[PDB]
Symmetry: C2
Amino acid sequence: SQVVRIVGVGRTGIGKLHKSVDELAASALKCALVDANMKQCDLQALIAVPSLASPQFMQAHHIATVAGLFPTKGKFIVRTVDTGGAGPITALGMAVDLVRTRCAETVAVIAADAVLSMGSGAFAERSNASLRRSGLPEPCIPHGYDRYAQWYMSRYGLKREQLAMVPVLMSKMAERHPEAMCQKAYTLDEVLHSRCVAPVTNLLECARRADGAVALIVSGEAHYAEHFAQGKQEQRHLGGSKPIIASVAEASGPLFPPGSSDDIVPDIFSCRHAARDAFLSANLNVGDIHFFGLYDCFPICLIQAVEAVGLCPEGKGGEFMETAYNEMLNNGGVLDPSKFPINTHGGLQCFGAPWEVPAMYNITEAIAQLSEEAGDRQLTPVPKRALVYGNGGIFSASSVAILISDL
Amino acid sequence: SQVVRIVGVGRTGIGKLHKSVDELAASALKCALVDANMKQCDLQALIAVPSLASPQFMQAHHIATVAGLFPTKGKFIVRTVDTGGAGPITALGMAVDLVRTRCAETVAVIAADAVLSMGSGAFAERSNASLRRSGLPEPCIPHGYDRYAQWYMSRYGLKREQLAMVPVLMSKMAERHPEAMCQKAYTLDEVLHSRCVAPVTNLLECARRADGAVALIVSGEAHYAEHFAQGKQEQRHLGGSKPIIASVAEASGPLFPPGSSDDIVPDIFSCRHAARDAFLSANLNVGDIHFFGLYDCFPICLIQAVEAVGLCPEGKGGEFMETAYNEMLNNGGVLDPSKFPINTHGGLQCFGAPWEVPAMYNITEAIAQLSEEAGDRQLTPVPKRALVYGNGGIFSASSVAILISDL
């Protein structure tokens, strides 16, 4: 239709899975089809993102072929897109175009990687190579965000300690999630005393290396209704279970900082414009959103995010974390989801981060919340509308999607 | 707007330039802006394709970053897409899509590579590496197309010499183009004596390694006319040179052929599907098109292409080549463009083929024809409608576009 829903979700476990990137993508897709009450034959498109552990020419075609999608009796469009960690949401928006232009009625979206099984040095060499010509000292990506962090410290008066609060808040959410990689919550002293990786960024502030794959099935509602609407789940929690993609939007910026502190400038950042356009396209505002899946590769990223989507004013993101951190201590060490409805799964900090995959977890957790299937992390009252956010490179790509349970 | 045109075209030379992918791509972008009467500030998006010579994380983002597109006060969307050699046309449809959804007023499309400057061993390993798990012997890609060619011979009655006529016909087109890398046309027996790479594929039947970059600028017609359309060039050839993208369509298939041969089936090929939908979307037929820029990595590809787009019946593409070679011989032999209005620049075989770039040359050659600037290759009367076709992997991706000067 014009109204397009996420009618299928499937994912592997997370951590060190000892499978190839190809095994993961196929396994996740088989799960997603089972979840959608579909078979291989029902797909009319497939979008994927590159893997750092197993980089591959025409990655999506490689996946579709090895998985055994071929031969097929119908038209099947295949694409690979690279916007870094913004990818799974970029691909979500592309899936929307394919349905609305009717080049494909059903679209599978797959992201898969195994950057934990690949090894610490191999990962480091390939990830560092990814930022060649940047002039960033190793490790390059953390140093890139660190440089932006130091800039915020000088410009808005951000404090090292407000940065360090992010993994703590994330660690609290994570221990309520059985699959999250951080099972023991961190102390602020654990984080501040954790190894320095860069001048203002320590080890427990760094994204958590993991293997994992997620497959989504996007389709038109009326289409799904005619052919697949046989499942007998109550329609309450079915709308959130197969949510409407209300809007998707993107904006971008430089791959690496200018290397000159006096060259760093506010309009490099792109998250707000995308969020702004996603809201416009959905005819909604931030006050109608009650779950936020926000990209958090490093603390500076999540801080900029809450400002961007309109949870707090610009420049006040460190304070936003503090008010939640203080309330945590002032609640028996309990981070009340309903007062911090953000990344209830743990995010990249504490749930897991397989390179370009983990923005998918912002989507899967959002659906869990909307369908009242988020367990010990469940927000009350149940959100009807969610916002998800993906970030790529070093504040280089922003992707924002709005998921709503019903119209 | 509703009508979307290619308002800018820029390209480097071709051959062995000994330049980096970033320098090639940037120079192509600089030319395209000059050709479109725009500046960087007027660009609001950028799509690019991966480079084999200098593979780069978030390739499009890297290019835009080094080029100095950033910072920007407005939204600037950047994406990297991978459909192989089908890429530039795939991205073309995406670029129009971006305009029609109003996510971007202007879109740059870039393809750049240096697979000749990269070296024979570097190229051989990576092209072969690109097809791992295919079970194809080295070189992998020629062998893949080789199998499909042999299948054509058994199923449709194609002849070995009819394959070799493709480079002959292309060499004839190539000798009329100052920039084509093959300047002296081949004889049919000459091609057959070239070193074998595969059972039905010789050295001169293989796409010609080259360096080169091409940049296109996509924009809405109503939008462009108001702000940048400054110049008193005749309106005839203004519709040309800045053609309307009438349609874009895609279809896909496996990245590589099966382990047998008798499992190969006509619906593996996707050019037929892509062309039909492109024709449907444009409301035209093959008889309304008077120039064809067709992907010709190997003779079987051009043979399959002409059948697919409806220049000759299914299975009759090799014969189509024979009749053109014969008609040529009883005339010089001089290959008259109007009787074989296909790849007048020389194609991948004899003009050049930098990996994912050369579909850009189908666009530049189509534009040269539509704008009456193709010199000795110039079709008369000036074509009103062109079809361009890009193919990726091993019959893995098809993208087809129809370009018209005016409606």
